[PDB]
Every structure is written in C-alpha cells, then in structure tokens.
Amino acid sequence: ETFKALKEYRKGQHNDSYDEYEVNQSIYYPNGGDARKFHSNAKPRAIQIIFSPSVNVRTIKM
Amino acid sequence: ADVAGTSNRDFRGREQRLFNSEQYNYNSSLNGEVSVWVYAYYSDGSVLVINKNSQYKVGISETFKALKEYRKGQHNDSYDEYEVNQSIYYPNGGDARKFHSNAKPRAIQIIFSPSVNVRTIKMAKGNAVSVPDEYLQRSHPWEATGIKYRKIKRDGEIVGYSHYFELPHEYNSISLAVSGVHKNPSSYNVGSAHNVMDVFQSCDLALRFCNRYWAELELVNHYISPNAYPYLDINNHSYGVALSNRQ
Amino acid sequence: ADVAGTSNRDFRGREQRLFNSEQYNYNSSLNGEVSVWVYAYYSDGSVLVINKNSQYKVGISETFKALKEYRKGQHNDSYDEYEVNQSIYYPNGGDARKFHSNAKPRAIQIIFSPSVNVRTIKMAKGNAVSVPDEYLQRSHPWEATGIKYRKIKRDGEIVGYSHYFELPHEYNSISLAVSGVHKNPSSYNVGSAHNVMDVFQSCDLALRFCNRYWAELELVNHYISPNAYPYLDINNHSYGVALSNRQ
Amino acid sequence: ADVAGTSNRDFRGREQRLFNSEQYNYNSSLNGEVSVWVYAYYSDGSVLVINKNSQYKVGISETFKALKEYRKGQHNDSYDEYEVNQSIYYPNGGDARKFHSNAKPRAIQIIFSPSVNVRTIKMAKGNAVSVPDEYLQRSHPWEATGIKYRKIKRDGEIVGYSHYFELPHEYNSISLAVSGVHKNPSSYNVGSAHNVMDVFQSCDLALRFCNRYWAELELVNHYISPNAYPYLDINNHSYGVALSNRQ
Numbered sequence: 001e002t003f004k005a006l007k008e009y010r011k012g013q014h015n016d017s018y019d020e021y022e023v024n025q026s027i028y029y030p031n032g033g034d035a036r037k038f039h040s041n042a043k044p045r046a047i048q049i050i051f052s053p054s055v056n057v058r059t060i061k062m
Numbered sequence: 063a064d065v066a067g068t069s070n071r072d073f074r075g076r077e078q079r080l081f082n083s084e085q086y087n088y089n090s091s092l093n094g095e096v097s098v099w100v101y102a103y104y105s106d107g108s109v110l111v112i113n114k115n116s117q118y119k120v121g122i123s124e125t126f127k128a129l130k131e132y133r134k135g136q137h138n139d140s141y142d143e144y145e146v147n148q149s150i151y152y153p154n155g156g157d158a159r160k161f162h163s164n165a166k167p168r169a170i171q172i173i174f175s176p177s178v179n180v181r182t183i184k185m186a187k188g189n190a191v192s193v194p195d196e197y198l199q200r201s202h203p204w205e206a207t208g209i210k211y212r213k214i215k216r217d218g219e220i221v222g223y224s225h226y227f228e229l230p231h232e233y234n235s236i237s238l239a240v241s242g243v244h245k246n247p248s249s250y251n252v253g254s255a256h257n258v259m260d261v262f263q264s265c266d267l268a269l270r271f272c273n274r275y276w277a278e279l280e281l282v283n284h285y286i287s288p289n290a291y292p293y294l295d296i297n298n299h300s301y302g303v304a305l306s307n308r309q
Numbered sequence: 310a311d312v313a314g315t316s317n318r319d320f321r322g323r324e325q326r327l328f329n330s331e332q333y334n335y336n337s338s339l340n341g342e343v344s345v346w347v348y349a350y351y352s353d354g355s356v357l358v359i360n361k362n363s364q365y366k367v368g369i370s371e372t373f374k375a376l377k378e379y380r381k382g383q384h385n386d387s388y389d390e391y392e393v394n395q396s397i398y399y400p401n402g403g404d405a406r407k408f409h410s411n412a413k414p415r416a417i418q419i420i421f422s423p424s425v426n427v428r429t430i431k432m433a434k435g436n437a438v439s440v441p442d443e444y445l446q447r448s449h450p451w452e453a454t455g456i457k458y459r460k461i462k463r464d465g466e467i468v469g470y471s472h473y474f475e476l477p478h479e480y481n482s483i484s485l486a487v488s489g490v491h492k493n494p495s496s497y498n499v500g501s502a503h504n505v506m507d508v509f510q511s512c513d514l515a516l517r518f519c520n521r522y523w524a525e526l527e528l529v530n531h532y533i534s535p536n537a538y539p540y541l542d543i544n545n546h547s548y549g550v551a552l553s554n555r556q
Numbered sequence: 557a558d559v560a561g562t563s564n565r566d567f568r569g570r571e572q573r574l575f576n577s578e579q580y581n582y583n584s585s586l587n588g589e590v591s592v593w594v595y596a597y598y599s600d601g602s603v604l605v606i607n608k609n610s611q612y613k614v615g616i617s618e619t620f621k622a623l624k625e626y627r628k629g630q631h632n633d634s635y636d637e638y639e640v641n642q643s644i645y646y647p648n649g650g651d652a653r654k655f656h657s658n659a660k661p662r663a664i665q666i667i668f669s670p671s672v673n674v675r676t677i678k679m680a681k682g683n684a685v686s687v688p689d690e691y692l693q694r695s696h697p698w699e700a701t702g703i704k705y706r707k708i709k710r711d712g713e714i715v716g717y718s719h720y721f722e723l724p725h726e727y728n729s730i731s732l733a734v735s736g737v738h739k740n741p742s743s744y745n746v747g748s749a750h751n752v753m754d755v756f757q758s759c760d761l762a763l764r765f766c767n768r769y770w771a772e773l774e775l776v777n778h779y780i781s782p783n784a785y786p787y788l789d790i791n792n793h794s795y796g797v798a799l800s801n802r803q
C-alpha cells in the first residue's frame with residue numbers, strides 16, 4: 001500500500017480532500033505543499049501486521 | 063563626551079537599564095497587569111490560546127465544549143460533535159460516528175505572568191459536565207496547584223510560571239477554570255473597602271483574547287515572541303525576555 | 310465479629326451513614342459549592358440547561374437571543390430568526406416569515422442546590438432588550454423571589470429549591486438573570502476584607518455547563534440522575550438523593 | 557597526518573569514492589532495486605507520475621481511465637468524463653459536452669532505473685478498451701521496445717533509460733503496461749526453482765507511488781531531484797546523479 005492508501009478515508013463523509021492533497025505534497029517533500037494543518041489526523045498512528053499460523057515466520061518480509 | 067561603554071557617564075546605557083527595570087517592576091506593582099494563558103493542544107498540532115489580562119486578579123473558565131477544537135470557516139462535523147458531547151456527558155449517551163473526537167484537547171498548559179503570586183493560583187479541573195470532583199456535594203470548588211508550577215526562566219530571571227498536564231487518555235474529558243492573584247507584598251488589601259469598587263471594575267476591564275494557531279511554531283513566532291510573553295515548548299525550551307537590571 | 314445489622318459494632322453501617330452525612334454537610338459549609346440551573350423548555354419538547362457551580366455565590370445571565378433554541382449541526386432558519394428578533398425587540402421591527410418562533414422558550418425552571426440561602430435569591434426577568442421593568446429609569450435591577458421557591462424533597466430531605474413559570478403567551482419574551490448566595494449561618498462575612506479576594510477568585514473559578522437535551526426523559530436519565538442533581542418534572546415528581554443521616 | 561587531496565592516505569577521499577561506487581553497484585546486484593516510472597503529461601502542464609520499485613523485475617499497468625487527469629479535491633466534470641469514456645471506448649458511444657477531454661494525456665515518458673536490462677523491457681500499448689493490437693485474436697501481448705530507449709546521462713554515466721512518445725492526435729487514446737527485468741549477467745536464474753518463491757514475494761513487496769504534480773518544474777524540484785532519480789525534461793535536459801567511481 002502507498003502512503004496515500006494507508007491514510008484514513010471516511011466513506012460518504014467529508015475528508016478535507018483538497019487539504020489532504022496538499023498534506024501529501026508536504027509529506028512527499030518538506031514544505032512542498034500548502035496545507036492548513038501541521039499534522040493530518042488521517043495519518044496512521046500505528047500498524048499491526050498479523051499472519052495466520054500457516055505462515056512460516058522465517059519467510060516473512062517487510 | 064566620554065566614550066561609550068567605558069564610564070558611569072554613559073547615560074544612554076544607564077537609561078536603557080533603568081527602562082528595562084522599570085518595566086519589570088511596574089508589572090509587579092499593584093498598578094500593573096496580571097495575566098494567564100490556557101493553551102489547549104490538539105492532535106492535528108494546532109493550539110487554542112485563551113488569554114486574559116487584568117489588574118489585581120485574573121482567571122479563565124471554559125466549558126468542555128468551549129475547549130474543543132473549532133476550525134473557523136471550515137467543516138467541523140458539527141452535528142456529529144454534538145453527538146460526541148452527549149456521549150462524553152454520559153456514557154453511551156449519544157450517537158456519534160467515532161470513538162475519539164480529534165477536536166478533544168490532548169494536553170493543557172497554563173501559564174501565568176511573573177506578576178502572579180504562585181501561592182494564590184487555584185484551578186478547577188472538572189469533568190465534562192463541569193463538576194470539580196465526581197459530585198457537587200463532595201467537591202471543593204478548586205485545588206491550589208501553585209507547587210506544580212515550574213519557573214520559566216531566561217538569563218536567570220523568572221519570566222513566568224507553567225503548569226502542564228497531558229490528557230492522553232480517553233477518560234481525560236474536562237472543563238477547566240483557573241485563577242491567580244497579582245503579587246501584593248504590602249499590607250494594603252486591594253480588596254479592602256478603600257479599593258474594592260476598583261477591583262469590581264477590573265472584572266469588567268479585563269481584556270480577553272482567543273485564537274487557534276496551526277502549530278506550536280506559529281504560536282512561538284506570531285503570538286509568544288512578538289508580545290514578549292513567556293512560554294515553554296514541547297522540548298522544554300523557555301521563551302521570554304529578561305528585563306530586571308539588564309540592557 | 311458481630312453479625313451485620315444487629316449492633317453498634319456494625320462499623321461498615323456507621324461509616325456509610327457518616328459518609329452520606331459528611332457529603333450533605335460539606336456542601337453546606339463555606340468550603341462547599343452552590344449551584345443554580347436554568348431550564349428553558351421548548352415546544353418541540355427539548356430543554357436547554359445552563360448550569361453554574363461556584364463557591365460563595367453563583368448566578369447566570371442570558372440574553373433573549375441566548376435563551377432561544379439552537380440545534381447544533383442542524384438547520385435553524387438562522388436568517389429568519391434574526392428577523393424574528395428584530396420584531397421581538399420592537400413591534401413590527403422585522404421581516405420574519407412566522408408569527409411565533411418555535412425557538413422561543415415555552416417555560417423556565419430555576420433550580421438551586423440545597424446549599425443556597427433561599428432569602429438571598431434574586432432574579433432579573435427583563436424584557437427582550439434586557440430592561441428589568443419597562444424602562445431603566447424606573448427599574449429595580451432585581452426582585453427577591455425566594456418565597457416562590459418550592460422545596461424539592463426526597464425522603465423528607467430538602468434536595469433543592471425550584472421556581473417555575475410558564476411563558477405560554479406571545480408577549481412572554483424575556484431576558485433573564487438569577488443569583489443566589491451560599492448559606493452562611495456564621496457571622497464570618499465571606500466578603501469581608503479577610504476573604505474578599507477569594508470571592509473575586511470564585512468569579513473566575515465558577516464552572517459552567519450548557520447543553521440542549523431532546524426530551525425531559527433524556528434530561529432526567531442522563532443529566533439529573535447520574536450527577537445526583539435535584540429536579541422537578543412536568544408531573545410534579547421530585548428527583549434527588551437524600552443524604553443527611555441516611556445510608 | 558598527510559594533507560588532504562595530495563596523497564593516497566586521504567582515506568576520507570577514498571571512502572567517499574567507495575561509498576558512491578558501492579551504491580551504484582549494489583543497485584545493479586541481484587539484491588538491488590529495479591524501478592520504472594510512467595509520466596503522463598496533461599495539457600494544463602500537470603504530470604501524473606506512477607512509480608514502482610521492486611527486486612528482480614518491475615512493471616506498471618494502467619487502464620485508459622486511470623491515466624486520465626484527476627484533480628484531488630477539486631471539480632473534475634466527473635459525469636461528463638464518464639460520457640467521454642463511453643465515446644472513447646466506441647465512436648459516438650457517449651453523450652459528452654466536449655470534443656476533446658483535457659484530462660487525456662498529451663504525452664507519455666517511461667523511465668527505467670539503470671539497473672534494468674534494456675533488452676528485457678516490454679510494453680503493451682493498447683487501445684482504450686485494453687487490446688494491444690486492434691483485436692485480441694491477432695495481438696502479441698507486448699512489444700520489446702528497448703531499442704527506442706535513450707540513455708539519460710550525467711558526467712558520462714548512464715543514470716537511466718527513457719522512452720518518450722507524444723499523443724498529440726485525437727485518436728491517441730491508450731491503455732498502457734510496461735515491464736522490465738533487473739540486470740542479471742550471471743547464469744544464476746533468479747526465477748529458477750531455488751529462488752522463484754522469492755520472486756513471487758517480490759510481487760507482493762513491490763512499493764508503488766502515484767501523484768499528480770502541477771508542473772514539470774515542481775516534478776524536477778520535488779520528486780526527481782530530492783530522490784536522486786533520473787529524468788529527461790521537455791528541453792532534452794538530463795537529470796540524475798553520477799556515482800560510479802566518483803566523489
């Protein structure tokens with residue numbers, strides 16, 4: 001998944017979609033955008049990766 | 063004339079030092095201001111400042127709703143946040159579309175000017191329905207929290223006092239009121255019969271300010287520094303101007 | 310040990326009774342809260358509560374506009390209600406599309422905590438432009454209305470005081486301010502020179518709350534009962550908790 | 557110590573040169589990345605980049621619809637562009653309000669990293685319904701287009717490979733897929749039984765990127781240059797960093 005695709009998207013609600021385009025430009029390069037916020041609340045705060053017990057743990061790659 | 067910076071006849075130098083000292087001391091006279099700031103920090107990095115500047119004593123009181131992030135001229139999920147409030151006022155009391163509102167403050171900093179007497183500071187940190195301690199019947203209406211205030215220092219001088227607490231937990235939903243009294247080392251009570259009507263007038267003359275800044279940077283650059291205000295930033299860095307006996 | 314509920318050595322029982330009594334009495338000490346609630350009832354069945362909780366004395370003051378129903382996050386005919394206000398401030402002064410605004414309160418209940426002294430209660434019920442009695446020049450700024458307050462009672466105990474008046478007529482368009490003073494049977498004046506600066510601080514530390522509930526049911530279930538507040542409902546039913554010398 | 561830049565004991569200098577050479581060579585080892593970029597240029601001067609970075613082999617495949625300009629958070633005539641697509645998929649198949657959509661790419665640049673083997677590059681340039689050559693029945697699923705790739709050069713070093721074609725005609729409506737294989741001068745087949753499951757994993761581990769930039773300038777300054785990527789601009793100017801045996 002891209003950085004964009006991991007960002008919170010609220011189906012059927014407002015998502016500050018223009019401002020979040022600007023947010024992305026400033027994340028891709030420092031001072032690259034014109035966003036109205038320092039930190040997007042759409043950015044993930046954490047990530048959990050889970051595998052089924054049928055995985056071989058030694059083959060996992062990230 | 064004597065050469066600058068080599069004698070006691072550098073009157074320009076003496077006048078500069080006096081000018082700075084007079085400012086520091088005027089503020090701490092009974093004729094001077096006392097000021098309080100409440101900073102609410104939001105998860106998007108923005109900061110609501112509420113400031114009040116008055117003579118004799120000063121304070122700020124805000125509802126849980128009024129401390130919540132409000133983006134002027136933008137969308138604020140206003141209906142959903144009404145539902146959020148109902149669920150904060152009572153568990154499962156609302157119909158919101160979110161577990162945690164990003165409009166809720168993540169932290170609070172309270173700063174007082176150096177003209178406050180730290181021992182007179184009082185805080186009422188209530189729950190979301192504005193009750194200081196679980197139930198009114200057993201609530202002392204305030205706690206004296208002066209001992210938790212850290213000195214904000216520049217060049218060895220106390221430029222202010224700061225109390226900071228984070229609200230990083232889901233149950234940290236608060237109303238908040240804070241108050242302090244201007245230093246008075248004299249035995250002239252400003253609230254004695256002679257001057258009490260002047261203190262009542264100070265209630266009406268107190269000047270208030272609030273604004274939401276987009277970042278701590280913007281706050282430091284365009285609010286704190288230009289007005290020679292004290293501040294303590296997230297990295298424990300002190301801001302302010304040292305004036306007492308200094309050029 | 311002795312068997313529960315058969316002797317004076319049921320210390321758990323004695324501690325329960327003391328705990329309740331201490332709460333009742335703490336509230337009525339000079340260290341305790343005094344609280345006032347104003348309920349505005351609207352024709353759609355919803356209720357605006359404004360509450361304020363403070364030491365020494367407490368009160369609330371609201372404009373005619375501020376008492377009007379406001380539905381957070383929904384449509385409120387906001388332009389038309391601006392026109393409504395102009396026609397309420399002066400006859401035929403506006404251009405509204407309605408004879409009677411459903412946002413106008415149909416009734417008002419004022420409740421005080423049992424820590425109030427009923428004889429200190431004062432109300433300023435003004436007209437829509439905030440004049441207590443027709444013209445400022447002949448207005449006493451308040452009426453002492455304590456004699457009209459009914460006792461809200463539970464188990465024989467006064468859990469609060471209520472004054473209720475309906476505004477069922479077209480000309481019942483009001484501004485409203487109410488105030489009361491915390492019980493003080495001592496001859497220590499809390500506003501005497503010794504403690505007056507603490508009362509000025511109480512002005513700043515007073516915690517405030519407002520919210521619109523959708524029904525009297527919702528108010529009873531999620532505002533009154535959870536916080537052990539007193540209330541009197543439309544069927545004259547008393548709500549509150551009896552604490553003095555009770556388990 | 558010896559003086560800088562006058563002897564073989566300038567270990568800082570030798571380390572710098574090695575560091576650069578190791579980077580160039582690591583990329584071209586079987587452990588390194590291979591990368592492809594597709595740039596679609598629009599008439600408003602903006603540029604969609606799609607990039608993919610993977611081990612062993614890499615490629616990108618996009619529908620005609622997905623190559624069309626999409627302005628995030630702005631109006632895109634979305635209904636009318638649905639109608640446009642119907643008329644591109646089949647002549648006179650839609651009801652659009654325009655002869656030529658400004659959302660259609662005016663040109664395409666394909667760039668590969670210098671770790672690609674140019675002889676393994678394959679392109680499927682299909683029509684708007686994703687058919688490589690008029691009809692499926694007579695379509696070879698790809699063309700080997702490596703011979704048309706120009707070397708992007710900086711300081712004598714190949715920093716990448718570019719294939720550019722304009723789509724300046726009304727009938728230049730395309731779907732597009734392109735692929736290349738990481739250099740492998742060894743006789744170890746990365747797709748042989750020993751390592752083939754690792755290549756299947758590379759399919760899942762391939763990192764993808766897309767974004768629309770407003771101008772070629774913005775692309776050069778904020779996408780190409782900061783990440784040390786190769787590029788060829790409209791004036792035939794080469795961008796990239798020369799690393800092999802250089803400080």
Ligand SMILES: Nc1nc2c(ncn2[C@@H]2O[C@H](COP(=O)(O)OP(=O)(O)OP(=O)(O)O)[C@@H](O)[C@H]2O)c(=O)[nH]1
Binds near residue numbers: 217307
């Ligand atoms: N006091 C002092 N300041 C120093 C010293 N070394 C560097 N400084 C810097 O110089 C500043 C103070 O300089 P001065 O104001 O001229 O020294 P002072 O102690 O105030 O002496 P007075 O002007 O007589 O009041 C401080 O902010 C320091 O960062 C030092 O050894 N002593």
Ligand SMILES: Nc1nc2c(ncn2[C@@H]2O[C@H](COP(=O)(O)OP(=O)(O)OP(=O)(O)O)[C@@H](O)[C@H]2O)c(=O)[nH]1
Binds near residue numbers: 464554
């Ligand atoms: N006092 C009293 N309560 C009754 C009686 N019959 C039923 N009750 C119920 O019991 C409750 C009070 O019971 P208790 O608290 O145990 O009686 P009490 O008068 O408080 O006696 P103490 O516990 O010694 O203070 C009331 O709320 C009544 O509804 C009765 O005859 N006398």
Ligand SMILES: Nc1nc2c(ncn2[C@@H]2O[C@H](COP(=O)(O)OP(=O)(O)OP(=O)(O)O)[C@@H](O)[C@H]2O)c(=O)[nH]1
Binds near residue numbers: 711801
């Ligand atoms: N090689 C070379 N570079 C020149 C010459 N004149 C100017 N330059 C510039 O200098 C740069 C290369 O300088 P160097 O790296 O120090 O020379 P070099 O050929 O790499 O020699 P080595 O450091 O031993 O590898 C090039 O980018 C040129 O633009 C010249 O006559 N020969």
Ligand SMILES: Nc1ncnc2c1ncn2[C@@H]1O[C@H](COP(=O)(O)OP(=O)(O)OP(=O)(O)O)[C@@H](O)[C@H]1O
Binds near residue numbers: 215216217219
């Ligand atoms: N290098 C120094 N040596 C001795 N005294 C100094 C020196 N620098 C400053 N001082 C003096 O010591 C006093 C304290 O200055 P200082 O800068 O240490 O305090 P501060 O700014 O409040 O805290 P800090 O700089 O540690 O964040 C001032 O009078 C200052 O002039």
Ligand SMILES: Nc1ncnc2c1ncn2[C@@H]1O[C@H](COP(=O)(O)OP(=O)(O)OP(=O)(O)O)[C@@H](O)[C@H]1O
Binds near residue numbers: 462
């Ligand atoms: N059935 C009873 N007989 C005698 N005394 C009672 C009885 N029930 C309650 N009491 C006592 O009489 C006092 C008054 O209780 P009561 O329930 O009548 O008052 P209340 O709740 O304020 O008003 P109400 O129940 O009439 O709405 C309390 O001390 C209570 O314990």
Ligand SMILES: Nc1ncnc2c1ncn2[C@@H]1O[C@H](COP(=O)(O)OP(=O)(O)OP(=O)(O)O)[C@@H](O)[C@H]1O
Binds near residue numbers: 709
């Ligand atoms: N003035 C020069 N005379 C001789 N050799 C040079 C000179 N300038 C650079 N070189 C060397 O010749 C090689 C090619 O450098 P050059 O700058 O000509 O290629 P380029 O950057 O890929 O293409 P171009 O500069 O023509 O756009 C490098 O090793 C460089 O160090």
Ligand SMILES: Nc1ccn([C@@H]2O[C@H](COP(=O)(O)OP(=O)(O)OP(=O)(O)O)[C@@H](O)[C@H]2O)c(=O)n1
Binds near residue numbers: 015016018020035
């Ligand atoms: N940095 C920004 C942010 C927003 N806006 C303007 O404000 C408008 C509304 O904000 P937007 O980001 O589009 O969010 P919403 O419309 O509220 O939500 P959504 O687009 O997801 O429906 C935008 O169209 C844009 O023109 C802007 O000038 N620049």
Ligand SMILES: Nc1ccn([C@@H]2O[C@H](COP(=O)(O)OP(=O)(O)OP(=O)(O)O)[C@@H](O)[C@H]2O)c(=O)n1
Binds near residue numbers: 137139141143159382
């Ligand atoms: N718990 C919720 C949240 C929202 N909505 C509906 O969705 C609409 C849009 O959401 P809202 O909360 O009003 O936010 P915005 O309109 O996007 O932003 P704002 O009101 O601040 O302009 C509301 O009018 C409301 O009718 C709802 O059904 N119940």
Ligand SMILES: Nc1ccn([C@@H]2O[C@H](COP(=O)(O)OP(=O)(O)OP(=O)(O)O)[C@@H](O)[C@H]2O)c(=O)n1
Binds near residue numbers: 387388389392
């Ligand atoms: N007496 C009135 C009432 C309304 N209008 C017009 O009708 C519009 C819509 O009515 P309004 O009073 O604004 O209510 P709503 O938009 O429906 O609700 P709200 O403003 O609270 O969102 C207004 O903008 C106003 O221009 C008018 O001409 N004169």
Ligand SMILES: Nc1ccn([C@@H]2O[C@H](COP(=O)(O)OP(=O)(O)OP(=O)(O)O)[C@@H](O)[C@H]2O)c(=O)n1
Binds near residue numbers: 630631633651653
């Ligand atoms: N060939 C077309 C083009 C548009 N419309 C109508 O015009 C409206 C507005 O145009 P649209 O194509 O939807 O563009 P915008 O709303 O302006 O932009 P966007 O949808 O991207 O926000 C559409 O909803 C559609 O009903 C139409 O009748 N037939």
Ligand SMILES: [Cl-]
Binds near residue numbers: 091093
């Ligand atoms: Cl003084």
Ligand SMILES: [Cl-]
Binds near residue numbers: 338339340
């Ligand atoms: Cl007491």
Ligand SMILES: [Cl-]
Binds near residue numbers: 585
């Ligand atoms: Cl290798």
Ligand SMILES: [Mg+2]
Binds near residue numbers: 216217218
């Ligand atoms: Mg210092």
Ligand SMILES: [Mg+2]
Binds near residue numbers: 139140141382
């Ligand atoms: Mg809304």
Ligand SMILES: [Mg+2]
Binds near residue numbers: 387
């Ligand atoms: Mg309107």
